[PDB]
Amino acid sequence: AVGIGAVFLGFLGAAGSTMGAASMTLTVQARNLLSGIVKLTVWGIKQLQARVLAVERYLRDQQLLGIWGCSGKLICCTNVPWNSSWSNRNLSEIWDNMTWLQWDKEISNYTQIIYGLLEESQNQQEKNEQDLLALD
C-alpha cells in the first residue's frame, strides 16, 4: 500500500495484493522483525528463549545481504543471469497477477541453488579485488 509509516498490521494485506505492488512499503517488515511485542516463572524464561532466537534469525538474514553485496538495500540488483529452467522468462507479465505468497512455490527447490550463484556474482568482485585498479 502507498504510505510507509503505517503499521505492520497496516501493510501485510499486501500478502494477497499483486507481487509488483507489494514491493512498495517494504521497510515495515524490516522494522517489525527486530523486537515487536517483546519471582521467576514460565513467562520469565520465555523472554530469554524467544528473544534470543528473534535476534539470531535477524542476523542470519542480514549477513546474507552483506555477503551478496546488497547491504542496507531493500531492493537490490545482482549480476546473475536468470536461468529459464528455474522459471519462464516472462515474470514481467505476471507479477501484476501473482502475489509474493504465491511466487515462493515456484522456486522452493531452487532457492538454495540460486544462493550459490549470487555468491558466484561476488567472486566476480572478489576476483576483481586484488589485481589492478586500486592504485587510483
Partner: protein, 461 residues
C-alpha cells in the same frame, strides 16, 4: 519473453509453518492482580494495548485445530504453572493418622454428607501431641482395613501419594490470558464463522495477540466460553469414528446457577512450626445441601437446536441422549471449580430423553471434595482449603462435550453421552481459530535489471 536478471527483495511479506514458545499477555490491569493468582502467571504484563488486527484480502490459508501446536503449548505450560504456585505450600504428610470418625451433628439435626473425625496431631514441640477434630466435608475417607472396627478411617492421600495444601494467598481464577507470538512470527486468525475445524479458510487476518482466552477447567460442559457467531457448530476429527470427542459450540448460552447453601466455618489446626492446616470446624446455620439450577425451557431448546444440527451429518436418524457411561467421579459427573470449592454435579436431567430435532427448573444434586487428583489424571494431589460462608455461582454454558455409542445400534437411532477428562479438549474449543507462522523473507525474484557496471550506484530498475 524478456531478458531478466536476478534481484533481491528481502523485507518481503511471506510466511512459513513453524511452532515456537509464545509470550502471555493479560487483559487490562489484571496483571497487577495476576501476581497473586494461579491459572495466571507472575505476571503476564502487556507492553501495548493489545489486541490489534488487519484483514488480509485475497489470502487463503489451510487451518487445522486437531493438529494445533498452540494447545500443547498451553496445556504443558498451565500444568507447569499450576504446580509451581503449589510448590512452596504446606504438605499434609503429618495428617495421615488413624482418624476416629463419627456422625457430624449440627443444631437440632445431622448432616448426611460428612463425618466428624478426630486425630492426634503434633504440637509446636515434637515430643507432645494433642487431640484435635475437624469436619472433613466429604464422606470420601477410606475406612481402614485389617480391623473389624467400623469407626477407624484414613485420609485417601496416603494410599498412593502425599498431598499439598492450596495456600489461602493464591486464588483460583479464569483470568483472560492473551498469547502473543515473538518477533519474526505472526499469528493468523480465521474469521470464517462456518469453519468446521479443518480445511481452507478464505477470510484470514493477522493479529498481535489472541483474544481474551480464559483458562477454565471443567468436564461435560464448557463454562464461560466464547460463543459461536451465527449458529450452533459441531466440531470433531471424524464424526464416523465413534471415538474422538464431538465438541459443540452454542451461539447463545444458558445460565447455570450453583450454590453451597451451608454456612461453614474455617478452623486452623497447628500441625507444625509454621505449617498450618485449615479445615471446616463447624456449621453455624441450617443445612440445605449443595445443588444447581438450570432453566427447563432454555436448556430443552438447546437439545432441540443441537439435535437437528447433528442430524445433518447423521441423516434420518433420531438423536437420543443418555446418561454417562462410566469413569472416575471427575468425568461421570459435571465437575468444575467455583469460589474455591470443587463441585461434582450429578446431571440429574441433562441427559434424558429422545430429541429428534424435527419438533414432531432442572435441579442437579452436587457432591464436593477437598482432596482432588488434578484433572489430567495422575498429577499432584491438592487439598483445597475450606471457604467460609455460603458460595454462589452464575456461569454461561457455551459448549457441550459428547461422545457416541456404536456400532450395531438400530439403524434409525443413535445414542450420545457426555465426555471429558482431557483438559486439552476444553481449550481446543477456544484456541481453534489461530495459527503460528514464521515470517520468512523469501528467495530471489527475477526482474528486467542488468549487471551492475563497476560498482556504480543506480536509481530505477
Amino acid at each position: 519473453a524478456e531478458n531478466l536478471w536476478v534481484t533481491v527483495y528481502y523485507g518481503v511479506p511471506v510466511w512459513k509453518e513453524a511452532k515456537t514458545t509464545l509470550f502471555c499477555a493479560s487483559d487490562a490491569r489484571a496483571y497487577e492482580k495476576e501476581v497473586h493468582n494461579v491459572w495466571a502467571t507472575h505476571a503476564c504484563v502487556p507492553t501495548d494495548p493489545s489486541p490489534q488486527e488487519l484483514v488480509l484480502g485475497n489470502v487463503t490459508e489451510n487451518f487445522n485445530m486437531w493438529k494445533n501446536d498452540m494447545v500443547d503449548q498451553m496445556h504443558e505450560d498451565i500444568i507447569s504453572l499450576w504446580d509451581q504456585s503449589l510448590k512452596p505450600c504446606v504438605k499434609l504428610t503429618p495428617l495421615c493418622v488413624t482418624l476416629i470418625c463419627s456422625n457430624a451433628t449440627v443444631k437440632n439435626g445431622t448432616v448426611e454428607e460428612m463425618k466428624n473425625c478426630s486425630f492426634n496431631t503434633t504440637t509446636e514441640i515434637r515430643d507432645k501431641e494433642k487431640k484435635e477434630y475437624a469436619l472433613f466435608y466429604k464422606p470420601d475417607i477410606v475406612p481402614l482395613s485389617e480391623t473389624n472396627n467400623t469407626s477407624e478411617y484414613r485420609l485417601i492421600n496416603c494410599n498412593t501419594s502425599a498431598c499439598t495444601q492450596a495456600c489461602p494467598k493464591v486464588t483460583f481464577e479464569p483470568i483472560p490470558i492473551h498469547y502473543c507470538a515473538p518477533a519474526g512470527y505472526a499469528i493468523l486468525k480465521c474469521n470464517d464463522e462456518t469453519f468446521n475445524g479443518t480445511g481452507p479458510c478464505s477470510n484470514v487476518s493477522t493479529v498481535q495477540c489472541t483474544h481474551g482466552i480464559r483458562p477454565v477447567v471443567s468436564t461435560q460442559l464448557l463454562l464461560n466460553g466464547s460463543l459461536a457467531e451465527k449458529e450452533i457448530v459441531i466440531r470433531s476429527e471424524n464424526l464416523t469414528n465413534n471415538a474422538k470427542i464431538i465438541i459443540v459450540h452454542l451461539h447463545t448460552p444458558v445460565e447455570i446457577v450453583c450454590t453451597r447453601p451451608n454456612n461453614n466455618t474455617r478452623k486452623s489446626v497447628r500441625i507444625g512450626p509454621g505449617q498450618t492446616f485449615y479445615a471446616t470446624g463447624d456449621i453455624i446455620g441450617d443445612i440445605k445441601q449443595a445443588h444447581c439450577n438450570i432453566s427447563e425451557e432454555k436448556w430443552n431448546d438447546t437439545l432441540q437446536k443441537v439435535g437437528i444440527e447433528l442430524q445433518k451429518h447423521f441423516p434420518n436418524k433420531t438423536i437420543k441422549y443418555n446418561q454417562s457411561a462410566g469413569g472416575d467421579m471427575e468425568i461421570t459427573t459435571h465437575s468444575f471449580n467455583c469460589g474455591g470449592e470443587f463441585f461434582y454435579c450429578n446431571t440429574s436431567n441433562l441427559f434424558n430423553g429422545t430429541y429428534n430435532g424435527t419438533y414432531i427448573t432442572i435441579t442437579l444434586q452436587c457432591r464436593i471434595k477437598q482432596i482432588i487428583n488434578m484433572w489430567q489424571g495422575v498429577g499432584r494431589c491438592m487439598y483445597a482449603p475450606p471457604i467460609a460462608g455460603n458460595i454462589t455461582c452464575r456461569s454461561n454454558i457455551t459448549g457441550l462435550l459428547l461422545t457416541r455409542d456404536g456400532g450395531t445400534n438400530s439403524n434409525e437411532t443413535e445414542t450420545f453421552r457426555p465426555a471429558g477428562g482431557d483438559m486439552r479438549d476444553n481449550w481446543r474449543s477456544e484456541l481453534y481459530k489461530y495459527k503460528v507462522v514464521k515470517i520468512e523473507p523469501l528467495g530471489v525474484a527475477p526482474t528486467r535489471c542488468k549487471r551492475r557496471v563497476v560498482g556504480r550506484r543506480r536509481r530505477r530498475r
